[PDB]
Structures are given as structure tokens and as C-alpha cells.
Design a protein around this ligand. Structure first.
Ligand code: MET
Ligand code: MET
Ligand code: MET
Ligand code: NA
Ligand code: NA
Ligand code: NA
Ligand code: NA
Ligand code: NA
Ligand code: NA
Ligand code: NA
Ligand SMILES: [Zn+2]
Length: 870
């Protein structure tokens, strides 16, 4: 059932009965008890008898005044203060109390170490005061903060400092104003003691912006890369999208206790310190690139999110899909576009596709939501970005930029919908996107089937392409989509055959708009090898009967790097499926020599970009492998990935070592070419680790001990864990002894513990709940130990005895009361039960039923559990 008393429905959206135009807040801050005074200027738009319904959660109400009159015509109901008999225009004054120190959910105003900080997206501001906590209510904020000066020397909020003072009893105050109207999800406050990295950026039209990065005392050495990436973000948004920052100060605060990654609060972003702090001996290349991504992402929200915001939470993809697309384009333009595209596609096929088949399936613009924090999803974010990328593919850059400009010109200063965005793109480009809009309302992954025919008499190549989407748990009815289907045809020399029809050029993006259609190309002078769905031109599963030689030919000749990688993946997939079937019969790994040879050729190809080689030589993860099957056998998948690694290691031993030694770098630098060389080197080391044991142990221990950087040390440590080499325990103990007082660094070690293939991994993981560097109160530690076990150690999580499931239930029973958002993230592997065999399925079901009986089950878990048990 898509019918629930607690569910909200998109189709029920109505404009609010009241608006707020200006709000003046005062915080009398204290960790045990904070007093909030909120003075709002309000305007009734609806009927004279409609009351004002303000959202509020766990607030202690002290007083309510309307135009300075203490009010009697109100009542408190569950999650609301309902005020009747209001004039048309009035001043509302609310005083209420809250308690940051009791806030373990980390929603609203809470404590991160000694700091106080906020998280208001999506519906967190209602935990601070009674408000119209909905993003179509935009208001101008003024925020005054009063606090103990020794404990909270920095008092920050959105915008600029407009006033400040010193009081008796060691207190002081600062007031802030932000001139841009905003929804309350974008409000922020920080109070604490910090080191501050200060810099400036001058915008293209000459506006000077003060940049300020606040980090815990002692962490300034790990701040410069984030600062540099902020500057890069600003410069890039200017160059690519013509967008400049619109305020005088840009503040970022790094906090250790944060449920998500980061938050785009206007002028005052708040970041998980995971996505800020880096130095060469604490952070890997991938960490540096993630910091760049996330810094960029929150900056890009300043236009796609802040200057134009969301009419209601069902429109989340309006800002997230677009902003992810922007962070991907940023990463891609500065770094390796091919490697970016490859990794985004790995995430789509391996994690997103699984969600879109799960009980939690939803369209990128959802129709029904119980707990909005459950919809910060792979679908809304990653599939949302693929939908924007499809629009880009259909329109081309120049038309796409015209559409962006019309979107802002229409909607700057307001809350918009997905439909308003698509309409701006259509009106600016004159490309019809009516059919295309179905991508917003339909869930599930389309399956595109392609058959082909070559007619040597006429030199025609005919593609017959059909599509369908299977029913999903949320929708019984599906229809065809407007699928942009990019192709390239290759001749026997590896050259592109021009596409034509009736002696006229044809565009290489086919418009696959029907359940079935046929495309006929002329002057196809040789029987072509096709590259199909180039650059993953739509988020679909492809069914095409590839021969192994078509694939190996594409690996050698395809023009774009991505299609070379994509062909390698299709070549492995066949043999992954073969060998999972073999594993279930107790048979050894079987692989044809010609498949090993194709990978040999990549290793020895002198012209190939090392970043591309490295991705071709990174086997699909267990998640991407799971996509290939209707019923997942988690034990066979893990064992096949390991056996395939062992087999290629034996077969390619000499070549692996040679490429490993050739890519040795004496200097460490954070530069894309050097990163590419290192990623290839370490991909070779991974295979070598699974080869002959004595050489493995020597290469790995030596890389670890001689590393001048976390990238090379961690690649070695990870390989020792994964291949269970003799040096493993000693390297793990060394890392612990060196880094235990550094939580971000320890997260890597917890993930390696959690993902270990050793036989007693669950026992070791349970014992790590008492480790000196673990705490249940910190979301990063939880995700690194518990989340990695459940989500990335499928063979242990899915042990036949059900011990993995019980472990997760015990953890969830704690997190359901402590931090429901983290609990809901962690439950995800249990809700996939219908992908598994009957026996596993029945144990997963019993685990879910046990959680369903928790006293005070959170809405967050309830939504996922009821869908899963349906
Ligand atoms: C609701 S927290 C998510 C923060 C921000 N919208 C991001 O995209 O990372
Ligand atoms: C890959 S083009 C060839 C299509 C089909 N095998 C034919 O011979 O007509
Ligand atoms: C994943 S390393 C194996 C476990 C390690 N020896 C420990 O007990 O901490
Ligand atoms: Na308003
Ligand atoms: Na936003
Ligand atoms: Na690039
Ligand atoms: Na990768
Ligand atoms: Na249209
Ligand atoms: Na065919
Ligand atoms: Na593929
Ligand atoms: Zn975002």
C-alpha cells in the first residue's frame, strides 16, 4: 500500500494560507537550555477563518504574542501550534526553549564536541522554533546570538555581522543579517571555538569575497586543500555557467558530528569534517577528489538551491539532480572526464539500479513520503543527475546554458518545481520535452533491447530497439520513455562509419520514444561493430547479444575512453555469471585465454591513458556484480571476485609487476596525472597481492612501510587485509597505534576491519564496538564499522546462520532511539530481502518483524520496514 495516515502526497500540495516575510531571531544559547525568541512578520493569504498552523517538535513553549498582545486563541497539537482569529497582517512573537545537549538525532540545534551547530534540512528548523517549516515560505532573516564568551568566542549565522556587543557575566552577542529571502531549511547557526583559515576570492566582475574556513583548534594544517577547492568551485561556476557569488563572506564550518556529508546554508555552509580535512599523510587521492566534489557541490547550490529553491520536498531533485550534475561536470572538467563518467556509471548500475528494484523504489520526483529524510537517495541524486545529463544530451551545451539562464531569469528569488525547470529548458531550446517529463514521474529502470541486421546488398544497418519498464513495488503501470540512445559504428580498421540515411547526415543520438521502433542507416560500407548507449546516454539496462570479439575489438579501437571500459565490463559480466553458476556447483573458476589476453593487452598498451587502464583493471565491486543476477548469491559473488582476481594475478603476473615498477613515483603530489599513475600502480598491486604469497607479502609490507602518503599506505594495507597476507595483523596494529586519536583516519581502518574476508569477521567487528576509536554517538564511526559490514561485506552479512542479520538488529535497536537517520541508512541491506534465496529471505523477514515490534519505532524505520514486509 501507497495509503498511510502518516504519508504526505505530492498531489496534495497547496499554497500556504499564511506567508512570513521577515523573521528576527534571538538565541540565548546554552547547551543544556537555549531560549529562542522569534519575531515574524506575517501575512494571511487564505480565508479569514483559516488558522495559522506552525510546525514544532520537542519545543517548550513559553509565550505567544500577536502584535504585542499575549494570545489566548491557540492550541498545541501533535507537532503543531495552531493559532486562530488572526488579522490579515501581524507580528507573531514566540518564545520557546530547547535543549541542544539532549539532541542525539543531530537535527535542529545540537552539540558537536564543544561546538553548537544546526542542521535544518529538510525539516529541522521546527526543532528550533514554531514556524512554517516548508520551503515555499521564504523570509528575510536577522539573527542575534548571545553566549558565554570563553566557551563560544565565534558566533556565526547566515550573511553579514550587523551588530555586536559585550554584556555583564562574561557574555557577548553578535547579530547577523542575510539580505536574500530564504526558506528556513537554509538557516544556520554555529557557536564555538575554532582555528580559522582566511582567504579571499575576487569575482569576475570584481566583487571581493572574504572566505573563512572554521575548523577545530589544531586542524589548520588540514584546511588548505578545501580552501583551494572552494576557490576552484567559484572560478569554475563563473567560467562554465556564468554564475558569481552574491554575498561578501563565504563561511564553511567543519564539524565532526554530522549525519550527512555537508549542507549549503546560505553563506554559512556546515560540512562533515570528512569532506574538509586532508593532508598527504591522512587522506588518500580519492579523499582529496571527494573533498573537491563536495566543496563544489555545496557551492553550486548557491544558485541551484538557494537563489532558486524548492516549492515542496517532493521537488528535491530540482536542486539535487541539477547540483549533482554540476558537481560531476566540475570534477570532469578539472580532472579526468572519462574516469569521472566511469565511476558515476558504476554507482548508477551497481547501487542505484538495486534501489530502483527495491521496496523503496521511487521516481526522482516522489509521489508519497512518510519521512523526508528517507528520500536523500541514490535515485533523487544520481538518477536525478542522469536525467539532467539526458536533457544536456538532447539540447547540447549552448541550448542547455540558454535554458539555465531562462530558469534563473524566471525563478530567481522564488521556490520552483521540477516541471518549471524542464519548461525553461524547452522554451529556451525549442526542443519538445513533453514526453521527456515522464522520467520525473516513473520509477524503475527501463530495459532497452537491441537487435541488429546488416544487409550487404544495400549496405544498410538496421537496429530494432524496444523498451519496457517492469512494474515496481510503488507503481503497477509503466509506459515508454524518451530515451536518448547514442551510438557509433566502427569499421574493420577501427574508424567511425558516418551515420546517414537517404544521403543526409543523421545525428548520433537516437530518439527511442516507442515500445518498439526500427532505425535504418545507409552507406554502411562494412559490417559494423557498434558502440551502443555511448557514455551511458540514458540510465537504462541494455540487452544486446555481444560476441566476445566485438567487445575486445571495442576495447582496442573505440574512440571514447568510456566505451573501451564499458566493453570490458560487458566482457567480464559474461564470465562473472558463468563463474557464479560454477561456484554453486563447487567447480573451479573457468576463463578463456582470449579474455585474459584482452586484459594483458591493456596492461601493455603504451598509448592508453593510465587512468583508463586503471579502471579497466579494477574489477566490478560485489554491488555491481549483484546487478547481473535476479537472485543474488552473496557468498558466490564474493568468492568469484576473489578467484577471478587470483586467476588474473597468476596469468598476468609478469606484466603486473612490470607495470607496478614502471609507475613508481618518488615524489607525492596531488595532480591528476600523478593520481592516474598511482591508481594504475595500486590496481596492479591489488592483483599482485593475490598472487604468489611470498612476493605478495614482500611487495605489500614494503609499500606500506616506505609510503610517504596515505594513498600508497592504504592501498597496501587494504591489499593485506583482502588477501589475508602474513603481514596483515602487524600492519593493522601499527596503523591503530599510530592513528587511533584521529577518527577520520580510523574510519578507513574500521572499513577494512568490517570488509575483511576472514572467517571470524563478525566476532572481530563486535569486539570493535569497544575499540578506543569507536563511538556509537558519532555517525562517521557508525557508518565506517557497522555500515560497511552490512553494506560492503555481503558474504559475512549474509552468513547462512543469520548472525549478520542479528547483529544489525541489535545495532538498529540502539540507533532507532539515538539517531533514526543513521538507523535508516543502516537498515537498507535488510530491505533488499526479496533479491535473496528463500532461506535468507525468511531470516531477513524475521529480523524486520523484530524491528517492526520496537517500542517507539521511528517514522524513518517504519517507512522502510512496512514497504519491505509488504
Ligand atoms: C539534508 S542534508 C543534504 C545536504 C545537501 N542538500 C547536499 O546535497 O549534500
Ligand atoms: C553487427 S552487424 C551484423 C548483424 C547480423 N549478425 C548480420 O549478419 O546481419
Ligand atoms: C582485518 S585485520 C584482522 C583482525 C585484526 N588482527 C584485529 O584483531 O584487529
Ligand atoms: Na514569505
Ligand atoms: Na538549497
Ligand atoms: Na577534464
Ligand atoms: Na573506481
Ligand atoms: Na512540449
Ligand atoms: Na544481430
Ligand atoms: Na557494459
Ligand atoms: Zn545537494
Amino acid at each position: 500500500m501507497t495509503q498511510q495516515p502518516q504519508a504526505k502526497y505530492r498531489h496534495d500540495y497547496r499554497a500556504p494560507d499564511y506567508q512570513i516575510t521577515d523573521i528576527d531571531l534571538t538565541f540565548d544559547l546554552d547547551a543544556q537550555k537555549t531560549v529562542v525568541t522569534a519575531v515574524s512578520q506575517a501575512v494571511r493569504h487564505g480565508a479569514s477563518d483559516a488558522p495559522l498552523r506552525l510546525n514544532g517538535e520537542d519545543l517548550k513553549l513559553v509565550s505567544v504574542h500577536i502584535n504585542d498582545e499575549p494570545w489566548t486563541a491557540w492550541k498545541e497539537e501533535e507537532g503543531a501550534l495552531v493559532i486562530s482569529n488572526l488579522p490579515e497582517r501581524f507580528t507573531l512573537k514566540i518564545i520557546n526553549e530547547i535543549s541542544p545537549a539532549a539532541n542525539t538525532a543531530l537535527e535542529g540545534l545540537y552539540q558537536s564536541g564543544d561546538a553548537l551547530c544546526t542542521q535544518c534540512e529538510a525539516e529541522g528548523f521546527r526543532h528550533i522554533t514554531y514556524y512554517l517549516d516548508r520551503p515555499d515560505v521564504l523570509a528575510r532573516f536577522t539573527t542575534k546570538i548571545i553566549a558565554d564568551k570563553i566557551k563560544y568566542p565565534f558566533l556565526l549565522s547566515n550573511g553579514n555581522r550587523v551588530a555586536q556587543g559585550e554584556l555583564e557575566n562574561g557574555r557577548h552577542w553578535v547579530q547577523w543579517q542575510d539580505p536574500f529571502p530564504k526558506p528556513c531549511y537554509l538557516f544556520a547557526l554555529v557557536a564555538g571555538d575554532f582555528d580559522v583559515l582566511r582567504d579571499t576570492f575576487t569575482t569576475r566582475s570584481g566583487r571581493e569575497v572574504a572566505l573563512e574556513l572554521y575548523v577545530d583548534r589544531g586542524n589548520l594544517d588540514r584546511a588548505p586543500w578545501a580552501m583551494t577547492s572552494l576557490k576552484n568551485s567559484m572560478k569554475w561556476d563563473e567560467e562554465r555557467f556564468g554564475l558569481e557569488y552574491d554575498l561578501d563572506i563565504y563561511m564553511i564550518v567543519a564539524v565532526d558530528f554530522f549525519n550527512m556529508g555537508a549542507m549549503e546554508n546560505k553563506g554559512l555552509n556546515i560540512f562533515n569534517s570528512k569532506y574538509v580535512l586532508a593532508r598527504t599523510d591522512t587522506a588518500t587521492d580519492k579523499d582529496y577528489l571527494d573533498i573537491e566534489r563536495v566543496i563544489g557541490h555545496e557551492y553550486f547550490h548557491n544558485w541551484t538551491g538557494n537563489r532558486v529553491t524548492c516549492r515542496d520536498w517532493f521537488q528535491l531533485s530540482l536542486k539535487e539532480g541539477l547540483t549533482v550534475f554540476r558537481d560531476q561536470e566540475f570534477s570532469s572538467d578539472l580532472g579526468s572526464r572519462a574516469v569521472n563518467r566511469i565511476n558515476n556509471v558504476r554507482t548508477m548500475r551497481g547501487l542505484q539500479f538495486a534501489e530502483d528494484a527495491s521496496p523503496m523504489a521511487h521516481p526522482i520526483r516522489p509521489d508519497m513520503v512518510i519521512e523526508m529524510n528517507n528520500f536523500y537517495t541514490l535515485t533523487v541524486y544520481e538518477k536525478g543527475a542522469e536525467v539532467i545529463r539526458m536533457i544536456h544530451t538532447l539540447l547540447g551545451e549552448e541550448n542547455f546554458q540558454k535554458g539555465m539562464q531562462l530558469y534563473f531569469e524566471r525563478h530567481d528569488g522564488s521556490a520552483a518545481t521540477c516541471d518549471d525547470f524542464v519548461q525553461a529548458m524547452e522554451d529556451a531550446s525549442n526542443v519538445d520535452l513533453s514526453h521527456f517529463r515522464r522520467w520525473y514521474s516513473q520509477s524503475g529502470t527501463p530495459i532497452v533491447t537491441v537487435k541488429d541486421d546488416y544487409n550487404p546488398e544495400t549496405e544498410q544497418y538496421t537496429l530494432t530497439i524496444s523498451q519496457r519498464t517492469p512494474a515496481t513495488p510503488d507503481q503497477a503501470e509503466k509506459q515508454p520513455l524518451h530515451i536518448p540512445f547514442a551510438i557509433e559504428l566502427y569499421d574493420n580498421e577501427g574508424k567511425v562509419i558516418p551515420l546517414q540515411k537517404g544521403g543526409h547526415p543523421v545525428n548520433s543520438v537516437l530518439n527511442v520514444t516507442q515500445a518498439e521502433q526500427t532505425f535504418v542507416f545507409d552507406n554502411v560500407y562494412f559490417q559494423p561493430v557498434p558502440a551502443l548507449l555511448c557514455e551511458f546516454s540514458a540510465p537504462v539496462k541494455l540487452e544486446y547479444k555481444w560476441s566476445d570479439q566485438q567487445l575486445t575489438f571495442l576495447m582496442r579501437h573505440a574512440r571514447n575512453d568510456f566505451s573501451r571500459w564499458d566493453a570490458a565490463q560487458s566482457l567480464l559480466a559474461t564470465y562473472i555469471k558463468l563463474n557464479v553458476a560454477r561456484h554453486q556447483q563447487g567447480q573451479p573458476l573457468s576463463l578463456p585465454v582470449h579474455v585474459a589476453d584482452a586484459f594483458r593487452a591493456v596492461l601493455l598498451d603504451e598509448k592508453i591513458d593510465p587512468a583508463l587502464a586503471a579502471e579497466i583493471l579494477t574489477l566490478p565491486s560485489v554491488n555491481e556484480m549483484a546487478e547481473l543476477f535476479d537472485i543474488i548469491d552473496p557468498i558466490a559473488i564474493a568468492e568469484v571476485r576473489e578467484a577471478l582476481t587470483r586467476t588474473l594475478a597468476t596469468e598476468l603476473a609478469d606484466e603486473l609487476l612490470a607495470i607496478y615498477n614502471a609507475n613508481y613515483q618518488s615524489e607525492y603530489r596531488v595532480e591528476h596525472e600523478d593520481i592516474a599513475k598511482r591508481t594504475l600502480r595500486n590496481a596492479c598491486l591489488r592483483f599482485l597481492a593475490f598472487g604468489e604469497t611470498h612476493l605478495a607479502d614482500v611487495l605489500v609490507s614494503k609499500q606500506f612501510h616506505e609510503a610517504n602518503n596515505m594513498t600508497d599506505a592504504l592501498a597496501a594495507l587494504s591489499a593485506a587485509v583482502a588477501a589475508q597476507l602474513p603481514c596483515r595483523d602487524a600492519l593493522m596494529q601499527e596503523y591503530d597505534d599510530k592513528w587511533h586519536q584521529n577518527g577520520l583516519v580510523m574510519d578507513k581502518w574500521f572499513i577494512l576491519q568490517a570488509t575483511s574476508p576472514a572467517a571470524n569477521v563478525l566476532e572481530t567487528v563486535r569486539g570493535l564496538l569497544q575499540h578506543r576509536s569507536f563511538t556509537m554517538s558519532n555517525p562517521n564511526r557508525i557508518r565506517s564499522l557497522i555500515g560497511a559490514f552490512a553494506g560492503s561485506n555481503p558474504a559475512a552479512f549474509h552468513a547462512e546462520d543469520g548472525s549478520g542479520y542479528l547483529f544489525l538488529v541489535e545495532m538498529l535497536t540502539d540507533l532507532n532511539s539515538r539517531n533514526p537517520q543513521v538507523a535508516s541508512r543502516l537498515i537498507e541491506p535488510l530491505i533488499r530481502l526479496k533479491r535473496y534465496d528463500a532461506k535468507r529471505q525468511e531470516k531477513m523477514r524475521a529480523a524486520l518483524e523484530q524491528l517492526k515490534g520496537l517500542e517507539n519505532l521511528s517514522g524513518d524505520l517504519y517507512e522502510k520496514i512496512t514497504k519491505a514486509l509488504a
